[PDB]
RNA sequence: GCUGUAAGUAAGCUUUGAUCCAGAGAUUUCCGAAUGGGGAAACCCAGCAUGAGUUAUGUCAUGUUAUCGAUAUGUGAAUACAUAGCAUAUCAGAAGGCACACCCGGAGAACUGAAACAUCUUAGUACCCGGAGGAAGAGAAAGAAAAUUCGAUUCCCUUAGUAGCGGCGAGCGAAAUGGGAAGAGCCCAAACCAACAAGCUUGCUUGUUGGGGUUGUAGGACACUCUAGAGUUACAAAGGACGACAUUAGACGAAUCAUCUGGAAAGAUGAAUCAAAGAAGGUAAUAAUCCUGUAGUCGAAAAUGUUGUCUCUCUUGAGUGGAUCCUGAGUACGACGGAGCACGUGAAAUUCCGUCGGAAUCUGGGAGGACCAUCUCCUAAGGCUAAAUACUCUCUAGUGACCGAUAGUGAACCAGUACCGUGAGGGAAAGGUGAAAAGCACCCCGGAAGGGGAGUGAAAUAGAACCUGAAACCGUGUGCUUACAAGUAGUCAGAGCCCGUUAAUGGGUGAUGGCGUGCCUUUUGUAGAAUGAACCGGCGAGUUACGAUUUGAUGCAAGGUUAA
RNA sequence: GGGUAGCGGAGAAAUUCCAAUCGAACCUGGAGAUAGCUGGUUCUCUCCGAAAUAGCUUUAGGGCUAGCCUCAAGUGAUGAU
RNA sequence: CAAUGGUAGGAGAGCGUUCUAAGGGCGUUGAAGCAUGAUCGUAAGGACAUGUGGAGCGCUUAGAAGUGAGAAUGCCGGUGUGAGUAGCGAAAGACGGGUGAGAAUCCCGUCCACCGAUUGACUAAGGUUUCCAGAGGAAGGCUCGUCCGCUCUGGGUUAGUCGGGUCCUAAGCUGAGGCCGACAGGCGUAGGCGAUGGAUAACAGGUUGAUAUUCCUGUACCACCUAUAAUCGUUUUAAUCGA
RNA sequence: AGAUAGAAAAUAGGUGCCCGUACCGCAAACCGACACAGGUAGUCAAGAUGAGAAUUCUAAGGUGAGCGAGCGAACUCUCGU
RNA sequence: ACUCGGUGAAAUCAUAGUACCUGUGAAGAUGCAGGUUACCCGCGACAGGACGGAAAGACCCCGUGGAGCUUUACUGUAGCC
């Protein structure tokens, strides 16, 4: 499981071996949108809300099973564990020490 | 991160702990047993009290106001006391619902089987009603047995389709013994009574106050002499006070990278790793190592079942005589008429119900399948009682040589719904775009529906009626045929004309000759004008349980074999 | 506006009516009633291969033995001309 | 060397479909299905190649069965033929103008015709939104349709006096206590419910797209309450209160 | 019968609740599966002619019927001679 | 009814390139044998046949099939004495 703004690598899809920062989580479907991933080409029609339209290139969501956090020490793809610092479930990179998720 | 499904656009809420998830509490409109009166449920119309309002009236709010029960007081007829009867007050007393199950009663068919039918069978079944309880019924011997009693009850296996009952027909059909599950005995009347409340003159007596002891070795009072464990599941019956696991939220939880093909890999290839975890489900394809998990471990504020105790609350245990006394009455039991018991008013002894009769009190009474005499066993006519046992509307976890949308529930999808019927009721049809909605910006014809490009996508004969897309059926092309012919439409023989394979003594069409009246069912016999099918597709009929017989097979054999 | 309900009701009587067919309405349940009757019964080859007759039958288009098939043991000239 | 037609029927050997156990395999470098083909075995049937198809499925041995369809006037669903046939559901239309992509069929006008104890006006029962104004044209209208009882959007029903509730009761239905009843329940008194009846105070005109004894203008009437009263007068009788 | 010190009188102010109200109603909105030639209680109901609510034409007011255009054979149907 | 424009079913149906005569036959033939006749495809019409369609014979006979009814059939029975 990953966080709202951390930097992750992708291992599925046309995009692998590529980094990028997560921009949305949507935990009800476990699908995240990472920046520069799954670029989409959506045909938007000229309406009232949108004066004109075109082919927008927005990012689409991918299953959480396709992304991984990087070891903040060695940028090494890694899993994530936990430890009880003062009773708080804080995260660990599982190959090194503490991993920070502030934004 | 959120504001359900439900998309959206809008206003917002949230790290100050919200959102969510559990525990607990509060609000909980109207109808319905429906309960203030009425009523075509989800609506009308009130009495009373108290408050709001208005100068007042109209109006409104909140209690209350059904009927029964029981209890308690008032009052009290025809009538004199007194009773009906009235009139109040109180009380988590009763109502109604349901699990289409299970259980105990009351009532009780028929088609059917007997190759007819009446006895009998279906069957004490179905359907009705009345009670329940989570279980119920049954239960501590007037019981089997000729025993050496499993010493209460039930339930399982066998006895055994035996004994038996049967217009001795159809067909019904045990019980004991033995092997197991379960491991419970317990109180009241009766005698009698210290003391007392009431009629009696304390001589006799009444009582529910209470003790007393409840049983066949015959138990108990009696008279002696003697001595202070239980339990709320029967055995009286209430409830605080500490713990213990478990359950109605959860927490942690090992170990994988690279290339190849791809739209995407979990695949292939190579090299690793973990395993108390290679259950399972996801993930853009087939993952032990990506995710949710799994093995393992941990974890409750609370509100519950449960249980150890500590309290607590209850409280007499024997012997020996045996003179008297007591031990369940309109009862047993008999007669008549019925039911029940495997067994048909019959021997019905065993046992019940209606109608008449109607006993004994231990020096007694009942049973041992007409029966008696003797023997043996037991001690009725009062009561309570857990366990093994039956079932699943639910809830929790899981399983399946069970179904995969004409199946599996009727219902995978707003289904007991469309719809049908006045109503009881009856009751459908209907799942699948993609990985992601990326759901086709623009242009062109058209009023629009459509379409054709361009673009999205791996794919758009995946474009929303959307996966695959068969046949009947409808079209558009054409290679070869056909306008002198008599055709169950094929076969067999064959020229001509086109084509070229799963290359083999090849494929398509067919001038002309020979032979030739579909198929099923049913029949002595059917082209039959006997029957059945318009055509395609799907579904649609000797299976399963128990027992008997026979054959093959396999153990092993004067032995073989278990059932619960 | 109401009342009489199916072993019942109603009938100036026709077996007439009772929610479009009433010698006993409809709807459920016993219920998959029973049906000696008709119809249907689904893949292939190989081997053998009948009967439409007795006797008895509430029996005559049904059944039961017997005769006639088939399969497997056994018997071993018993069979036929 | 002999035998091999065959129905009721007996016997034997087998081919196929789903699932399971194990072993061994195939699969986006394209599975199952589907379609085609001139291929193989004695048959039930088995392969191979090429297209569509976009994920599962074969083979060996053995086990189990919802295992094989062409007929049951079988059931369900599709599609034929009859056939461009029958039918188009009582009737008088014509024409000018307009509207639109389109007009015998819609809007306006003129003429003509039909009803007129009614095809007219009301009002009940019943149906519930079909009512009105814009807009649309798939579907429904037995044709067409620019139209509508169709679809979309937004609207529309105003009461002291009208009809009910409120007041009364009939036929019936319920019925405390009560009578009778195997249970269930049936019957029934007092009392209630229940109009199709009895009793009850508003008329005219105007008014919009839709309402009007309802709204508004005019004028009224019936109940009820409050303030006031012009003197009714033992509050028994009264100005007068009454089951 | 009881009940009571009170309001009638000649005024002037106020208060009057719930339900139904659209629309069709001899009809394409109802009972007949249908925009069905059937059924659907009651009220008003004019003129000419007449005895009349008969009959023919018309007023008030509604309506021209949800398929048509041809040709005027057989044969049916309705009608006249 | 017929032609044209619009809309547009149904009963039925084993596949059908569906002739006549005389015969044969389950004894009354579009499908069989021997002859005779007949170019291919429509539209209006008639009804002889397809033992035409529709309804598992409104008659008849069987089923140890039902049902309703009758009586001095049997057995029983509410009720009455
Ligand atoms: Mg035939
Ligand atoms: Mg024929
Ligand atoms: Mg037929
Ligand atoms: Mg009668
Ligand atoms: Mg009749
Ligand atoms: Mg016929
Ligand atoms: Mg017949
Ligand atoms: Mg007849």
Swiss-Prot record:
Gene3D superfamilies: 2.30.30.30
Keywords per UniProt: Ribonucleoprotein, Ribosomal protein, RNA-binding, rRNA-binding
Signal sequence region: none
Membrane-traversing stretches: none
GO cellular component: ribonucleoprotein complex; ribosome
Entry-linked SMART domains: KOW
GO molecular function: rRNA binding; structural constituent of ribosome
GO biological process entries: translation
Assembly with partners or alone: Part of the 50S ribosomal subunit.
Function according to Swiss-Prot or TrEMBL: One of two assembly initiator proteins, it binds directly to the 5'-end of the 23S rRNA, where it nucleates assembly of the 50S subunit. One of the proteins that surrounds the polypeptide exit tunnel on the outside of the subunit.
Family from the record: Belongs to the universal ribosomal protein uL24 family.
The protein's name in its UniProt record: Large ribosomal subunit protein uL24
Organism of origin: Staphylococcus aureus (strain MW2)
Lineage, uppermost ranks: Bacteria, Bacillati, Bacillota, Bacilli, Bacillales
Gene giving rise to this polypeptide: rplX
